[PDB]
């Protein structure tokens, strides 16, 4: 069902290396709905190429636009399994400290802060 489950470690590594070659300015991001999640919809895809200069605050705005949320629906984003310490950090910096061993940056969203 989940991305890590659908693709072998070897396959995720090779795909990160292709994005390096073909989209060298992009951060490879996996974005997944919390398996408990009731309110928010699922995204139309799993794998996102994010411009390495956007900060986490702008990535939250991007995802909320992709879900076509309205102003008072709540949205919480975990990165590498934990809360974001700050939304002002550029994604190139967040990537270097929170990337997985396969080379993707893993995110999960929910309407509850209690995931
Ligand atoms: C640490 O990365 C590698 C290690 C061994 C062989 C290839 C790579 C690689 N990285 N990006 C591409 N396109 O290939
Ligand atoms: Cl690029």
From Swiss-Prot:
GO terms for biological process: autophagosome assembly; autophagosome maturation; autophagy; cellular response to nitrogen starvation; cellular response to starvation; macroautophagy; mitophagy. The keyword Ubl conjugation applies. Most abundant in heart, brain, skeletal muscle and testis. Little expression observed in liver. InterPro entries: Atg8-like, Ubiquitin-like_domsf. CDD domains: Ubl_ATG8_MAP1LC3B (cd17235). One of its GO terms (cellular component) is microtubule. Changing residue 112 to P: Abolished delipidation by ATG4 family proteins. Keywords: Autophagy, Cytoplasm, Cytoplasmic vesicle, Cytoskeleton, Lipoprotein, Membrane, Microtubule, Mitochondrion, Phosphoprotein, Ubl conjugation, Ubl conjugation pathway. GO terms for molecular function: ceramide binding; microtubule binding; phosphatidylethanolamine binding; ubiquitin protein ligase binding. Gene3D superfamilies: Phosphatidylinositol 3-kinase Catalytic Subunit, Chain A, domain 1. The precursor molecule is cleaved by ATG4 (ATG4A, ATG4B, ATG4C or ATG4D) to expose the glycine at the C-terminus and form the cytosolic form, LC3-I. The processed form is then activated by APG7L/ATG7, transferred to ATG3 and conjugated to phosphatidylethanolamine (PE) phospholipid to form the membrane-bound form, LC3-II. During non-canonical autophagy, the processed form is conjugated to phosphatidylserine (PS) phospholipid. ATG4 proteins also mediate the delipidation of PE-conjugated forms. (Microbial infection) The Legionella effector RavZ is a deconjugating enzyme that hydrolyzes the amide bond between the C-terminal glycine residue and an adjacent aromatic residue in ATG8 proteins conjugated to phosphatidylethanolamine (PE), producing an ATG8 protein that is resistant to reconjugation by the host machinery due to the cleavage of the reactive C-terminal glycine. RavZ is also able to mediate delipidation of ATG8 proteins conjugated to phosphatidylserine (PS). Disulfide bonds: none annotated. It is a lipid-anchor. Pfam families: ATG8 (PF02991). It is found in: Cytoplasmic vesicle, Autophagosome membrane; Endomembrane system; Mitochondrion membrane; Cytoplasm, Cytoskeleton. Changing residue 31 to A: Decreases C18 ceramide binding. 3 different light chains, LC1 (a cleavage product of MAP1B), LC2 (a cleavage product of MAP1A) and LC3 (produced by one of the MAP1LC3 genes), can associate with the MAP1A or MAP1B heavy chains. Interacts at microtubules with CABP1 (via EF-hands 1 and 2) but not with calmodulin. Interacts with FYCO1 (via C-terminus). Interacts with TP53INP1 and TP53INP2. Interacts with TBC1D25. Directly interacts with SQSTM1; this interaction leads to MAP1LC3B recruitment to inclusion bodies containing polyubiquitinated protein aggregates and to inclusion body degradation by autophagy. Ubiquitin-like modifier involved in formation of autophagosomal vacuoles (autophagosomes). Plays a role in mitophagy which contributes to regulate mitochondrial quantity and quality by eliminating the mitochondria to a basal level to fulfill cellular energy requirements and preventing excess ROS production. Belongs to the ATG8 family. This is Microtubule-associated protein 1 light chain 3 beta.
């Amino acid at each position: 069902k989940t991305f890590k489950q659908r693709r072998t470690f070897e396959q995720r590594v090779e795909d990160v290396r292709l994005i390096r070659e073909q989209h060298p300015t992009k951060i490879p991001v996996i974005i997944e709905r919390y398996k408990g999640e009731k309110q928010l919809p699922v995204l139309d895809k799993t794998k996102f190429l994010v411009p390495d200069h956007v900060n986490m605050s702008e990535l939250i705005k991007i995802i909320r636009r992709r879900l076509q949320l309205n102003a008072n629906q709540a949205f919480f984003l975990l990165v590498n399994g934990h809360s974001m310490v700050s939304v002002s950090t550029p994604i190139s910096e967040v990537y270097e400290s929170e990337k997985d061993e396969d080379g993707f940056l893993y995110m999960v969203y929910a309407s509850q802060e209690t995931f």
